[PDB]
Structure 1
Amino acid sequence: STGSATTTPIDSLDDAYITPVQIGTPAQTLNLDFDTGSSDLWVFSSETTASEVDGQTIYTPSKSTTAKLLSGATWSISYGDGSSSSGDVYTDTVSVGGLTVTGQAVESAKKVSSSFTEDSTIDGLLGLAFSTLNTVSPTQQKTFFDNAKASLDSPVFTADLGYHAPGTYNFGFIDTTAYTGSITYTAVSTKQGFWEWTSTGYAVGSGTFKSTSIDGIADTGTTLLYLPATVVSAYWAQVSGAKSSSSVGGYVFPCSATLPSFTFGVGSARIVIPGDYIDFGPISTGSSSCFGGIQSSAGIGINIFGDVALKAAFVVFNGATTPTLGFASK
């Protein structure tokens, strides 16, 4: 089997991407944020505290003939932005892009933090990191990918995120028309439950490539690129007037600037992030200070190749017995 779904940016900055997901029978279509940095499929629901729902589409298990309570099971998750959610669990049929999993754990939110309530465009999360991070207790549950794996033509999924445009998530096959050149594969450590890999270095603009090992995670559910402070300082030093602002919470730059590209290594290959991808626009409406898309990972404890980086590539998440990541230009 295979599946193929279009993923659409939630707003003009590509802050996140939503993908329609069919849950239950008859189908209830919810727009979920596919998150390779977490392992819970959770949804706004008929159980979510009414004051915490503001325009999201909700899952109503009582309207699904295939829903079953996973008796006793609860979940609770906290994300690196300080957001959180928690609730109980149903099993139901879930389909993405024509690929169907029966008996998927669908984590029904009873509570969500303010950041979720305030984002009317995101109806929940579909985690695609390793199932060892799933938060369901007392019986940990599998991701949609882990449950689909054995049925797929190839044990893979691919992320092809757009810049200010829709893109694609594919399951079970590699669309050889979706990228240019060859795919360079790199080793993954699952020790922390993430798609964790080691970049071979970086370049700023037209500058020389610095060969240096940068451990980090491929995380579709993080907006920005978070890298060590040394790398980030080297990048922003090439932008007149850029500075780190403790009041704003990161690097800002003059909206009149033209940003340099940023290159990261994947083995001997190179992925180039155009400068325009690093523009996150005015810090507040009408401001001439703009927020940067490359930020320091210091204090976060991990480097994160978020959407700013991943949208510059065709990315293969290879879930074979020995997992690997692949990157191609596109």
Structure 2
Amino acid sequence: STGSATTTPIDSLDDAYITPVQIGTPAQTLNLDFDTGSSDLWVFSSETTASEVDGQTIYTPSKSTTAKLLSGATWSISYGDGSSSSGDVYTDTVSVGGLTVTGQAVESAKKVSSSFTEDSTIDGLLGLAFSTLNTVSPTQQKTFFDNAKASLDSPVFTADLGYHAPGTYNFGFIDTTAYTGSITYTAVSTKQGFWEWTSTGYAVGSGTFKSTSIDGIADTGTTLLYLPATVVSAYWAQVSGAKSSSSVGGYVFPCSATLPSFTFGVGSARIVIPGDYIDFGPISTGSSSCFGGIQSSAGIGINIFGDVALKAAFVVFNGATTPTLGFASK
């Protein structure tokens, strides 16, 4: 089997991407944030505290003839941005882009933190990291991909995120028309539960490539590119007037600037992030200070190849017995 679903930016900055997901019978379609940095499929629901729902579409398990309470199971998750959610668990039929999993754990939120309530466009998350990170207790549950894997034509999924445009998540096949050149594959460590890999270096603009190992995670659920402070300083030094602002929370730059590209290495291959992709717009409405899309990972404890980086590539998440990642230009 295969599946193929379009993923759509939630706003004009590509802050996140939503993908329609069919849950239950008859289907209830919710727009979920596919997150290769976490491993829970959780949804706003008829059980979510009413004051914490503000415009999201909810899953109502009592209206699904295939829903079953997973008795005794609870979940609770905290994300790297400080947000969180928790609740109980149902199993139900879940379909993405025509690919159906029966008996998928659907984690129903009883509580969500304010950042989720305040974002009416995201109805929940669909985790695509390794199932060792799933938070369901006392019986850990498998991700949608883990449940689907054995049925797929090939044990892979691909992320093809658009810049200011829709893109595609495919399951079970590589679309050889979706990228240019060849796909370069690189080793993955699953020891922390992430799609963790080592970039071979970077360049700023038209500058020389610096060969240096940068361990980090491929994380579709993180907006920005978080790299070591040395790398980030080297980038922003090429933007007149850019500076790190402790009050804003990162590097800012004059909105009048033209940003240089940023290149990262994948083996001997190179992925170029155009300068435009690094502009996250005014820090507040009407400001002439703009927020940068490359930020320091110091204090986060891991480097994160978030959407800024991933949307410059066609990315293969190869879930074979020994997982690997692939990157191609597009």
TM-score, length basis structure 1: 1.00
Deviations 1:14-41 (A, max 9, x none): 0000000000000000000000000000
Aligned to 2:89, the other structure's residue is in SS state strand
Deviation at 1:185, TM superposition (A): 0.1
Q: Deviations over 1:240-260 (max 9, x none)?
A: 000000000000000000000
User: How far does residue 111 in structure 1 lie from its aligned partner after superposition?
Assistant: 0.1
How far the C-alpha of 1:9 sits from its partner, in A, is 0.0
Q: How many Å apart are 1:168 and its aligned residue?
A: 0.1
1:196-217, Cα deviation, whole Å (9 max, x unpaired): 0000000000000000000000
Question: Residue 132 of structure 1: SS of its match in structure 2?
Answer: helix
What is the DSSP-based 3-state SS (H/G/I as helix, E as strand, rest coil) of the residue aligned with 1:51?
A: helix
CA–CA separation in structure 1 for the residues paired with 2:66 and 2:80:
33
Aligned-pair distance for 1:75? Answer: 0.1
**Once the two structures are superposed, what CA deviation does each residue of 1:170-193 show, in whole Å capped at 9, x if it has no partner?**
000000000000000000000000
- In 2, Cα distance between the equivalents of 1:16 and 1:40? 17
Query: Using the alignment, how far apart are the partners of 1:150 and 1:82 within structure 2?
Result: 34
Aligned-partner Cα distance in 2 for 1:39–1:228: 25
**CA positional deviation for 1:124:** 0.0
Q: Which runs of 5+ in 2 are unaligned?
A: none
Match of 1:103 in 2: 103
Q: Deviations over 1:48-96 (max 9, x none)?
A: 0000000000000000000000000000000000000000000000000
Which residue in the other structure is 2:180 paired with?
180
Q: Secondary structure at the match of 2:233?
A: helix
Give the Cα–Cα distance (whole angstroms) in 2 for the partners of residues 244 and 127 of structure 1.
Answer: 32
SS at match of 2:158: strand
1:88 maps to 88
1:121, CA displacement in angstroms? Answer: 0.1
Offset at 1:328? 0.1
Name the structure 2 match of 1:59. Answer: 59
**Distance of 2:230 and 2:133 partners within structure 1:** 30
In structure 1, what is the Cα distance between the partners aligned to 2:186 and 2:141? 27
CA offset at residue 227 of structure 1?
Answer: 0.1
Counterpart CA distance in 1 for 2:103 and 2:123 is 20
Query: How many pairs align?
Result: 330
Task: Compute the displacement of 1:293 (Å).
Answer: 0.0
Say if 2:293 is the partner of 1:293.
Answer: yes
RMSD of equivalent CA atoms: 0.1
C-alpha distance in 1 between matches for 2:168 and 2:140: 29
How far apart, CA to CA, are the structure 2 residues paired with 1:255 and 1:141?
A: 45
Cα offset, 1:311, TM superposition: 0.1
Residue by residue over 1:266-299, the C-alpha shift from the partner in whole angstroms, topping out at 9 and shown as x without a partner, is 0000000000000000000000000000000000
The corresponding residue for 2:195 is: 195
| Counterparts of 2:25 and 2:157, CA distance in 1 | 25
Indicate the SS of the match to 2:226. Answer: strand
SS of 1:140 mapped into structure 2: coil
Give the TM-score of the pair, scaled to structure 2. 1.00
Which whole-Å CA distance do the structure 2 matches of 1:38 and 1:246 have between them?
28
Where 2:231 maps in the other structure, the secondary structure is: helix
Moved over 4 A (4+): none
Query: Matched residue of 2:302: which SS?
Result: coil
